[PDB]
Structures are given as C-alpha cells and as structure tokens.
Structure 1
Amino acid sequence: DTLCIGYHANNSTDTVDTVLEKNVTVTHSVNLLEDKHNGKLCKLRGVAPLHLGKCNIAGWILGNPECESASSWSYIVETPSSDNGTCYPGDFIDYEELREQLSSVSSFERFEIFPKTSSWPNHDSNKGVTAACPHAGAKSFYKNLIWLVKKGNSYPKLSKSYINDKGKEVLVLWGIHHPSTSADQQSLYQNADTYVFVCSSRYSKKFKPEIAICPKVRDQEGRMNYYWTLVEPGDKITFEATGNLVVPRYAFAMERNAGSGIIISDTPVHDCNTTCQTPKGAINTSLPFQNIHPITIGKCPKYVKSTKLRLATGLRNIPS
C-alpha cells in the first residue's frame, strides 16, 4: 500500500521569467502588460473631443472662412494636415498658451461682442477683405474679427468697451495690421502715426504699426498680429485706436477645464468611451502597465518599453 504526494501538471505552454531562470513553463499565468488599443479616438468622461478637421486652433478660433466650426469637449484633435489657420500672415502671440487653455472646456458659447450692425458708425466695416483669406473664390476675412478701414478720407479715434455680463470668462481676440508701405497706411487708415490701446482691469497693452516690406506670405508683404485675453465676469475691456485695429466681432463665453491636451492624429473619431486616450487609439484595461504610446490623456497605465510582463500564478509545468 502506498501514499504519494504530488502536484498538478497540464497542457500549458506559457513561459515566464524569474530572476534565477528564463523561459520557465508554468501551468497558469497572467499578463500585466496592456498591449492592445482599439484604433479609435473616443470620448473621455463620456464627452467627445473637438475635432477641427482640416483646420488648426488658430483657424477655428479666428474664424478662417474654411472653418465654420459643440459647447463642450474633453480634448482637441487636429490632423497632421490641418493647414487652414492664420490666412493673413503674422504672429499669433502666446499661441501655444491659448491652445492649452482651449484644450478642454465645460461651456463654450460664441457671441457677437461688438455687433457689426451698430458698433462702428464712424468707420468702414465692409472693405476689410483680402485674397489671402478667400471664400468661394472671392476676397474675404476672418468671421470673428472685423478689419476696420477709414471712410471718406477720415479715421476718427475710436473708443469701444465691453462689459462681461456672461456669468463666466470671455475670450476676446483682436488683430493689429501692419501695412507694407506708408502709402498703404494712409490709404487704409488716413493717419500716418497711429496707435491701438486695449485695457481691462487686468490687461493693458499699447500697439504701434510696424510698417515695412516683409517677404510675401500668401502674397502679402504686410502683416497682421493676433492677440487675445480672458476677461473676467463683471470686468470691462476697452479698445482705443487711431488706425490699424482689427476689432473683435465674435468673442467666446467659456468655462475652462483643468488639465487636458491636444491630439494630432489621423486616427478616426468614434462613439465609444475610454478612460485613457492615445494618438493611435484608446486603451481600456485594468492592467498597471502599457507599451502602446508614451503620450496619453486620461487615467492610464504607466508606459514601459517592455514587450512581455507575465506574472506566474501556477507552478512550473512538468508533464514528463
């Protein structure tokens, strides 16, 4: 009569590594490394990204004619070929900071801050168009700004204020135009020596035209610089100018959302939820580690450049 003590064996072929030995065959094991993604750009928090298509944030926010663009989004997606941005050449001041701050919002509403109907009685608001910003083959301009110009050989000093009665922050953007020549200066704004001044309770800046013949960009030798600021609720912002001012027409009442970001990718958007987004696709896993992509948005596994993290659960498999 005999009694034998022994352990389980099976048809398992799974291998794991130990500090002492590599490629040990065990009866049972579990993977700790997430290496699968769904190839999609999904909703975070149950909220869709803002997808700008062939436009970049500059084109969308200024209202470039090729961009007609929700009241909420969890992050922003641009394509590698999102070229339609600032169609009139010039510097977009603090552009990356603006993009970061528009990356996620809980509330976003465009509104005519300075109604083109009655805002500018002493200036021409119908000539500010350009081949640099075409629409339907004809000269046009940004939808959210107005390129004011003299009427009847006179450009009176302008002074305009807006009081923020939106229960939240207001994003106001404006431009400063710099002619290539003094003839163009006079032709556009009459006055030769001009300024623009913009001030709220926080913000304050004075602008001067910088006239010169610069290299042609989109066939323009002149330039247009773009500026923005966030006006707090209850606060007033004032514009003063004797020329060269591209005035706000549409601004944005908004509620900013913390720490999201921007994805630049051809990956298609889709109606699914994820807790962790990659530019290659979404990741839905309970696993602690991940080797899909270092650049992620959400509550994600940690990125590692491992290709195998297999945890043994069972014992060494010895069928014999």
Structure 2
Amino acid sequence: GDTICIGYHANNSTDTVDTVLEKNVTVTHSVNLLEDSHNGKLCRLKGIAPLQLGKCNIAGWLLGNPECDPLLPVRSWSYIVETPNSENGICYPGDFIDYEELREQLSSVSSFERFEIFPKESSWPNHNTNGVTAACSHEGKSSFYRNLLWLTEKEGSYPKLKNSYVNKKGKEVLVLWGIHHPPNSKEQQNLYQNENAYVSVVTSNYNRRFTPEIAERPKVRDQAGRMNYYWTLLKPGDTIIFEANGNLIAPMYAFALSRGFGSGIITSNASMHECNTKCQTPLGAINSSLPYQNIHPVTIGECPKYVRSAKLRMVTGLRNIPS
C-alpha cells in the first residue's frame, strides 16, 4: 500500500564537533568560532601607520643614539614596533631612571613634535658643547646623543649655569637629560673644574637635586664612568629650570606629546606592508569577526579574545548519517 516516511537531512559533510557525552561526532553543518589565520604582515590600524623604531629601542630613540635612522620631525602612529635584536639602546653606560614608567607613558601617546628646546649655539654660554665619546660611536667616529649635549669646562672655568624653558606648545613636553659620574676626581676637575658640583631641575610638580658619585667602576663598553638618564613631563604653561655648575648632560631636543586611546608597544620580527587592519598582532594582522583566536595574546585594536584552544567548532546541523 501507499506509504509516507518522516526523516532528516544527510550530506557528504565530514565536519566533526565534541559534546559532553561524545567526541568526534560528524555533523551536516557547523561554524568555526576560533580564528587561527593571519597574513604575517604589519599593517596600518584604522588608517594610521605604526612607528617603526627599527635598529633602536625606546631608550635609543628618545636619547637619539646616532646609529638609528633619524625619524621625521613630526610623526603619528597607531602602535609602536621594536625588534627583538634592538642592539642600539643606551650607548653610554649607566641607569635609565623610571624607564618602564616612561614606556607605560608612551603607550598612551598618539603623536610627537621633535623641537629644539635649547638651541646648541646660544643655550649654554661660556661652556663647551663639542663633548663626544667612543661608547656612542657613529660612522666609526666618536659621537653623542642627537637630543642631549655634553657640557664641559671652557678655558679652564665651568661657570654656574641657569636656564629655563616655558612650555607654550599647549601639550605635555617630555624633557630628557643626563648626569655624568666620572670614575675619579682628576677627570671631574678636568671636565667640570669643580669637585663639589651639583645639578638641580625644577618645575611646578617636579623637584630633584643630583650629586655625582666618584668611584672606579668595572669597564662597560670600555667606560669606567657612568651616565644616569632622567625625564619629566612638563605640563602645558609650566616652566622647567635647569641649574648646574657641572656634570649636566643638557637637554637639546624635546617632544610635544599628543595622547591617544588603544595604543601600545609590541615586539615583532614582521615587515611593514601597504595594508590596513582593525586587529594587529606581533605575528600578523587578523581580518575576522570570529569571537575567539589562538594566534597571540598580544593584540592592538579590536580583536577576538585569545584562548589556548586548538579547536572551537559549534554544531548547527544534525548528526550526519548518510548510510
């Protein structure tokens, strides 16, 4: 006699999912929720190219180590790229004070203007400005930081100097300077003429006095002396005053900072291409609306949530039984 049967779809699908009761269940239809695919390139983020420090690290860039290709006088970026072999860093040995805090500050910076805060040929009368060192060599010749100036005695005297800059940029100004610690008392007299020198730096919300410490240190990059590096953010409208009678590595160039959201510092071996993404990782850019990814825990922009999972596939169709 006539018949009617009730049944369900099957097809040639080989997709599998797991359930609580059962593993490796073949299903007719499913959806991947775990993004694993990237293009292996550095791209722009929402229109803005990243800042590539190249041979420099943050310390090398801001001090202006001569080995690093000079960047434009004005730049903007969506994120900051260092490389794993950042060999050009601090070139003259010593301590960089609050380096990690300065990096954290830079992570919310969207642009800078590099400008001459203290013009070399005017800023420091009756002092030598030609001081160089083999620790910061460029083109085989002894050189020095592009953003600092080694002040030393002139004609056998180091007069007390006092200089201030007034921040009329309408943005925070990052000022960097150094304090030199000769290995012995004879170098101190030769360089600065005054055994009991001091340095002071003052703003509305910053005050610190620096005194040199003379002692024979182990040779580092062939130097027994040391150079400590300090920084402050000069608020819009505020004044910075430098007072010193020796051992001052004076600021020459400073940076007018603009704040952004969604920036950060990453380390990457990848190369810049002419591409654009909403999500950048150190391995490559992700172009995905998927909720999860197993590519990298470091993300810039609007990214899927990073997880350790090897597979996340949700069944939509039915248990596939084409037999």
TM-score by length of 1: 0.97
Larger mean Cα displacement after TM superposition, 67-76 or 171-180? 67-76
Measured against aligned partners, the alpha-carbon deviations of 1:103-133 in whole angstroms (never above 9, x if no partner) come to 353331011000112111121112x101111
Q: What is the CA-CA distance between 1:216 and the residue it aligns to?
A: 0.9
SS in 1 for 2:137: strand
Q: 2:101 aligns with which of 83, 94, 97?
A: 97
SS in 2 for 1:152: coil
Larger mean Cα displacement after TM superposition, 135-144 or 255-264? 255-264
Partner of 1:316: 319
Q: 1:307 aligns with which of 287, 305, 310?
A: 310
What letter matches 1:208 in structure 2? T
SS in 2 for 1:60: helix
Partner of 1:176: 179
The 1:94/1:312 distance shift into structure 2, 3 A limit, reads same
Q: Percent identity?
A: 76
Does the 8 Å CA contact 1:213/1:222 hold for their aligned counterparts? yes
Does the 8 Å CA contact 1:74/1:103 hold for their aligned counterparts? no
Q: Following the alignment from structure 2 to structure 1, what is the Cα–Cα distance between the partners of residues 274 and 231? A: 33
Partner of 2:252: 249
Does the 8 Å CA contact 1:106/1:256 hold for their aligned counterparts? yes
Structure 2 gaps of 5+ residues are none
Does residue 1:75 correspond to 2:75, yes or no? no
SS in 2 for 1:118: helix
What letter matches 1:187 in structure 2? N
Does residue 1:107 correspond to 2:108, yes or no? no
Q: What is the CA-CA distance between 1:45 and the residue it aligns to?
A: 2.3
Does residue 1:41 correspond to 2:45, yes or no? no
What letter matches 2:61 in structure 1? W
Q: What is the CA-CA distance between 1:55 and the residue it aligns to?
A: 1.0
Q: 2:125 aligns with which of 121, 128, 138?
A: 121
Aligned pairs for 1:212-223 (under 5 A) are 212-223=215-226
TM-score by length of 2: 0.96
Q: Following the alignment from structure 1 to structure 2, what is the Cα–Cα distance between the partners of residues 110 and 249? A: 10
Does residue 1:162 correspond to 2:165, yes or no? yes
Q: Following the alignment from structure 1 to structure 2, what is the Cα–Cα distance between the partners of residues 65 and 12? A: 61
Partner of 2:286: 283
Structure 1 gaps of 5+ residues are none
Q: 2:189 aligns with which of 179, 186, 191?
A: 186
Q: Following the alignment from structure 1 to structure 2, what is the Cα–Cα distance between the partners of residues 267 and 19? A: 40
Does the 8 Å CA contact 2:29/2:317 hold for their aligned counterparts? yes
Indicate the RMSD between aligned Cα atoms, in angstroms: 1.2
Partner of 1:15: 16
SS in 2 for 1:81: coil
